[PDB]
Design a protein around this ligand. Structure first.
Ligand SMILES: [Mg+2]
Ligand SMILES: [Mg+2]
Ligand SMILES: [Mg+2]
Ligand SMILES: [Mg+2]
Ligand SMILES: [Mg+2]
Ligand SMILES: [Mg+2]
Ligand SMILES: [Mg+2]
Ligand SMILES: [Mg+2]
Ligand SMILES: [Mg+2]
Ligand SMILES: [Mg+2]
Ligand SMILES: [Mg+2]
Ligand SMILES: [Mg+2]
Ligand SMILES: [Mg+2]
Ligand SMILES: [Mg+2]
Ligand SMILES: [Mg+2]
Ligand SMILES: [Mg+2]
Ligand SMILES: [Mg+2]
Ligand SMILES: [Mg+2]
Ligand SMILES: [Mg+2]
Ligand SMILES: [Mg+2]
Ligand SMILES: [Mg+2]
Ligand SMILES: [Mg+2]
Ligand SMILES: [Mg+2]
Ligand SMILES: [Mg+2]
Ligand SMILES: [Mg+2]
Ligand SMILES: [Mg+2]
Lengths: 185, 51, 222, 159, 58, 172
RNA sequence: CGUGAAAUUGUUGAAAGGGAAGGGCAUUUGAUCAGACAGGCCAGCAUCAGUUUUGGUGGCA
RNA sequence: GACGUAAGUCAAGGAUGCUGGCAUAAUGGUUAUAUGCCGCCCGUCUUGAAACACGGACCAAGGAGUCUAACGUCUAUGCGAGUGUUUGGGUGUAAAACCCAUACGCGUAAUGAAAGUGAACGUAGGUUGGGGCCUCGCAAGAGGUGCACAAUCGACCGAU
RNA sequence: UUAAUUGAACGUGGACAUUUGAAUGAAGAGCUUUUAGUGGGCCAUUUUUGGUAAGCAGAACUGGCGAUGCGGGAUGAACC
RNA sequence: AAGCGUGUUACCUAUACUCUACCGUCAGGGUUGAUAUGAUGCCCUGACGAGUAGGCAGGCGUGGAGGUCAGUGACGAAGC
């Protein structure tokens, strides 16, 4: 017998592979598993882990988010890296000329980047030209703006969104939401 | 692949501790102490033998 | 011609100089040990010769063996036993003696036997049952380079350097002692010497402080 | 049936001390409290306004708010399997500065002075405290102190 | 029929199986419950220090 | 515990600024080893002076050997013991060649005749009676008569085998 | 009246059986059975290694 | 690592060497039996079942978390400020597959009972962290940038 | 806010380094979503209420049985 | 005494302890210019293994469906 301080046989709880069966994604993982092992550049390990992520955990990255990132001083010539999808954003009217490396590009995003004079690159071409992630800018989309996140942690005085089908008057706007009817949460 | 215990397996005892060879050669485990001849004071002997 | 010979010649000569260093440090330690023990022996004789008493300095180190199984342990003793890394029966470890640790031993007396370990018992314990904690794994010492790669930044280049840091409770005792995986001892080879273990050593049992008799017990289990 | 009013089981906790009833001395009102001060909670049964609940007796907290006659105190309270932040509005009478914080600041001052003087010489001058150590060796003489003691004594009734 | 009325048996074991946790301090705690007069003036003091630093740095 | 051993144990209160060099109290303790002797010392100093193991210090422990292990002596022993219903003092006489085995005999005697465990016994005093006719118990006094000699009737021999072919004798 | 299971039953053969029978580990006995000679099976001694158990003896404190 | 000046050797990061019998029921497997020791009847409710608690004489076959509408979290996939061809139309090798307009749904705006009004002072803010990247460094470290995320103070929209 | 930069709170800038301010350990740490079963308990030591008492009824802390075989207490849920 | 109190040794045996092997699980690593083509592969290192209710994972079996083995079969399919 052993007085176990920790739970036995506990899995790490981190993805060690993509749940996806996409063969090309698994080839990209084959590439960055090699690069993470045979280089000491932290970029390769970060990209590898991002390659494992689920869909909600790799939100879209907008071209305007990329352009804002390129406004960081000393960052205007960095290769933006997005382990995910880059979407188009018509709310920006001046896009800079830059090389963006991403898993997926939408048609609008690719057209906007190319029309700016820039380049759209796959992650393997990024691995060829920046094996240690040289001069790279990893960008991530907003995880907590998901609709599902609105409803997490619901409870009195927490101010989250109730899980509700129909909205408007008559749908949870009464006793429990105003002092005139009972109380307010 | 196999833990060879020092304190036997003289070879492993010599891989660790190069000083074991000098220790055994000079018999430092059977070292004589110089014969000094001090004697406890009378108060000590009387106290010890007190009832 | 990959120039393997230059690497081999440099690496063998490096091995010889490290071994010369360890050799001269083991000789100095042996001088330090024998000089110390003869100093206390003579100091006792001279105090008696002068009508005084030499009160030997209180022991700085204890070796603790958990002698009780895992079930039915109250939660405070259970926590202390985990903090002393005695997670199973007949596991043993070294503890540096201060008030902060003597109170822990007070809390876990009915579950452990401890006492003051001699140089010989420390040496045999480290030599036979000595394992290092390296990248969370239990690694047999078995070679000085394993010790130097993990404790060399404290000046501990050999298994005897480690033993020296333990017995003479040095500035890096804590790092050296934690590096050592908790010794996993056997049952005593000639039995415990008692009919019933779970009474104090004073009471005719096995547990509690049995100060210099811990050496005989640990030697039997080792 | 049962009874769990606000001040239940406070018969002794909210006692005044013996021969220590009456008006509160003016020192408790002239003590100054700033945000971040560590304070101890001990209710004064004479001052019925702004009292801590009996749970907070003997608890030590941090000042987060200072008002006219009172102080806001943050206490960590174990509710089930976690701790929760509690904010208490207590008048100054039910509050005193904790001498633990004052003495730690004293050690911080002494550490700074010892560091400043050690920078002249003696690197690694052992700033950390140490647990009490086993005693060193010593020589005990019998000059005027010869050992002399008896055995256990026989049994007598004494009644 | 009658049954057990109350017991705290096993309750500390449940409470400790997931490690009774401290409230996870932060720098900049919420200014909830601070005196409104101070809070109002703190707004303007922070606005002024923002202007001073922005002019100082640019 | 092949036998008891007698230790002199000298200890004192811990020295202070108020009282450096305290009084150095000493006892003779019959114990199986050093650890028990030190424990018994503190236990008995517990009952005489305001001091315990934490406020005190063991200056010396020294085994006390018999001056003449090979001389038969008559020992008078004063013991205090707890029976099931109270505390009692008694005085017994044991004839043997050493104090340690006389005390060992005494603990066996107290266990046998009064069911008094080592837990429940205080050795108040052990002292040899240097003169005959100061011996008072008849069970030890009978052994001091001049030219004493007795037989050992009914000798029972130990057989190593299970079966004997001889129908033995108990002569002597 | 295709095949033609089980429960249950007859016959023949084998075996065991002092108030149930059936089961686990192990081996004896009987019956029965597979594979390999381009090393398969079972052992014996020697010199070693790992872990242990029981003796003899030497030197020191 | 040891030994040897070196050659090389060794008990030094896990057994080799020599020799014999048999090559088949001999070892082994399976099975029946015997012997030693052990073994209470399953299922179930229950604090507690071998229970003098219940169901069960036996055997075969049948025999119990399904589908559907709407939905929550998570995951895969397609496209992405969009998305959804399949009500319908065209077409067909004909309930398939292939092609498609106008709409409609959900999203891209909230808030108020409602009338209504309706989202940049600022590099879409400041502060504290923050992976990664950049510069300097043998390195440690230092400096610049700092996405996601976390805490917090503000700014904007609506209600009051 | 003060009679009054007097303070208050937040800060600009500068100085401090691994003995950075006790010991021990740390098994990775922190965090989130979601959902099962459960919501009859019982027993031992110690504290303890009602009761003459109970293999009774009811609480405290801990350890157990339930959910657990194994060696021992012949036998036995809980004892060792 | 093979009883009672006490003391000393020797000795017996648990699924516990020490070492070794094998299985599995978890963890940390190695391995691409022929890894001498199994990269959900191979390999190295360490630790761990009780379990009702319950959760999850990897597998085994059955009726039918798309594809493949140009699979088997009256020279005997299936069933028993
Ligand atoms: Mg034996
Ligand atoms: Mg009340
Ligand atoms: Mg209930
Ligand atoms: Mg038919
Ligand atoms: Mg037919
Ligand atoms: Mg049949
Ligand atoms: Mg019959
Ligand atoms: Mg049988
Ligand atoms: Mg051997
Ligand atoms: Mg057979
Ligand atoms: Mg039986
Ligand atoms: Mg019932
Ligand atoms: Mg049953
Ligand atoms: Mg029923
Ligand atoms: Mg029936
Ligand atoms: Mg039926
Ligand atoms: Mg069926
Ligand atoms: Mg129920
Ligand atoms: Mg149940
Ligand atoms: Mg037993
Ligand atoms: Mg019995
Ligand atoms: Mg039993
Ligand atoms: Mg007896
Ligand atoms: Mg299991
Ligand atoms: Mg089928
Ligand atoms: Mg057929």
């Amino acid at each position: 017998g052993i007085d176990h301080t920790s739970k036995q046989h506990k899995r790490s709880g981190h993805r060690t592979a993509p749940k996806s069966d996409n063969v090309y994604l698994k080839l990209l993982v084959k590439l960055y598993t090699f690069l993470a092992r045979r280089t000491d550049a932290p970029f390769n390990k970060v990209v590898l882990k991002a390659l494992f992520l689920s869909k909600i955990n790799r939100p879209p990255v907008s071209v305007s988010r990329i352009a804002r990132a390129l406004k960081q001083e000393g960052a205007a010539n960095k290769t933006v890296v997005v382990v995910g999808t880059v979407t188009d954003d018509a709310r920006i009217f001046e896009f800079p000329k830059t090389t963006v490396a991403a898993l997926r590009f939408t048609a609008g995003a690719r057209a906007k980047i190319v029309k700016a004079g820039g380049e759209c690159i796959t992650l393997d071409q990024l691995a060829v030209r920046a094996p240690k992630g040289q001069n790279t800018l990893i960008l991530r989309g907003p995880r907590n703006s998901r609709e599902a996140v609105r409803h997490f942690g619901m409870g009195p005085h927490k101010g989250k969104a109730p899980r509700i089908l129909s909205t408007g008057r008559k749908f949870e706007r009464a006793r429990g939401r105003r002092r005139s009817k009972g109380f307010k949460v | 692949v196999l833990k060879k215990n020092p304190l036997k397996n003289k070879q492993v005892l010599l891989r660790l501790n190069p000083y074991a060879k000098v220790f055994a050669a000079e018999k430092l485990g059977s070292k004589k102490a110089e014969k000094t001849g001090t004697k406890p004071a009378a108060v000590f002997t009387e106290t010890l033998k007190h009832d | 011609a990959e120039q393997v010979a230059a690497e081999r010649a440099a690496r063998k000569a490096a091995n010889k100089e490290k071994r010369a260093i360890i050799l001269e440090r083991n000789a100095a330690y042996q001088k330090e040990y024998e000089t110390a023990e003869r100093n206390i022996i003579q100091a006792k004789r001279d105090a008696k010769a002068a009508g005084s008493y030499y009160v030997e300095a209180q022991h700085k180190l204890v070796f603790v063996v958990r002698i009780k199984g895992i079930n039915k342990i109250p939660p405070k003793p259970r926590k202390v036993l985990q903090l002393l890394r005695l997670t199973r029966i007949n596991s043993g470890t070294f503890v540096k003696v201060t008030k902060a640790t003597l109170e822990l031993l007070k809390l876990i007396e009915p579950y452990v036997a401890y006492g003051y370990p001699s140089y010989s018992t420390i040496r045999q314990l480290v030599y036979k049952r000595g394992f290092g904690k390296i990248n969370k794994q239990r690694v047999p010492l078995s070679d000085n380079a394993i010790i130097e790669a993990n404790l060399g930044k404290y000046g501990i280049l050999s298994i005897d350097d480690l033993i020296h840091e333990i017995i003479t409770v040095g500035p890096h005792f804590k790092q050296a002692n934690n590096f050592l995986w908790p010794f996993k001892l056997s049952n005593p080879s000639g039995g415990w010497g008692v009919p019933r273990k779970f009474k104090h050593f004073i009471q005719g049992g096995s547990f509690g402080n049995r100060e210099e008799f811990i050496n005989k017990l640990v030697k039997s289990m080792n | 049936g049962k009874s769990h009013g606000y001040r239940s089981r406070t018969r002794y906790m909210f006692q005044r001390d013996f021969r220590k009833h009456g008006a509160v001395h003016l020192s408790t009102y002239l003590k100054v409290y700033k945000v971040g001060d560590i304070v101890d909670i001990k209710a004064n049964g004479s001052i019925q306004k702004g009292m801590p609940h009996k749970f907070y007796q003997g608890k030590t907290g941090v000042v987060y708010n200072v008002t006219k006659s009172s102080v806001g105190v943050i206490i960590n309270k174990m509710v089930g399997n976690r701790y929760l932040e509690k904010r208490l509005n207590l008048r100054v009478e039910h509050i005193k500065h904790s001498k633990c914080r004052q003495e730690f600041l004293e050690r911080v001052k002494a550490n700074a002075a010892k560091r400043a003087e050690a920078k002249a010489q003696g690197v690694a001058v052992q700033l950390k405290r140490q647990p009490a150590q086993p005693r060193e060796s010593r020589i005990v003489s019998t000059e005027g102190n010869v050992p002399q003691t008896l055995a256990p004594v026989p049994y007598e009734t004494f009644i | 029929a009658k049954s057990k009325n109350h017991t705290a048996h096993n309750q500390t074991r449940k409470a400790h199986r997931n490690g009774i946790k401290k409230p996870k301090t932060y720098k900049y705690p919420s200014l909830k419950g601070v005196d409104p007069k101070f809070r109002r003036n703190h707004k303007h003091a922070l606005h002024g220090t923002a202007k001073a630093l922005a002019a100082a740095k640019k | 515990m092949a036998h008891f051993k007698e230790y002199q144990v000298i200890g004192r209160r811990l020295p202070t600024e108020s009282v450096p060099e305290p009084k150095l109290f000493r006892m003779r303790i019959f114990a199986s080893n050093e650890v028990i002797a030190k424990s018994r010392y503190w236990y008995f100093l517990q009952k005489l002076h305001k001091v315990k193991k934490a406020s005190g210090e063991i200056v010396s422990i020294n085994q006390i050997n018999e001056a003449h292990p090979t001389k038969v002596k008559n020992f008078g022993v004063w013991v205090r013991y707890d029976s099931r219903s109270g505390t009692h003092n008694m005085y017994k006489e044991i004839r043997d060649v050493s104090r340690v085995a006389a005390v060992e005999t005494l603990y066996q005697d107290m266990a046998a005749r009064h069911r008094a465990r080592f837990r429940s016994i205080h050795i108040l005093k052990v002292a040899e009676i240097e003169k005959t006719a100061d011996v008072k118990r008849q069970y030890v006094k009978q052994f001091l008569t001049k030219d004493l000699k007795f037989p050992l009737p009914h000798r029972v021999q130990k057989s190593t085998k299970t079966f004997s072919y001889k129908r033995p004798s108990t002569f002597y």
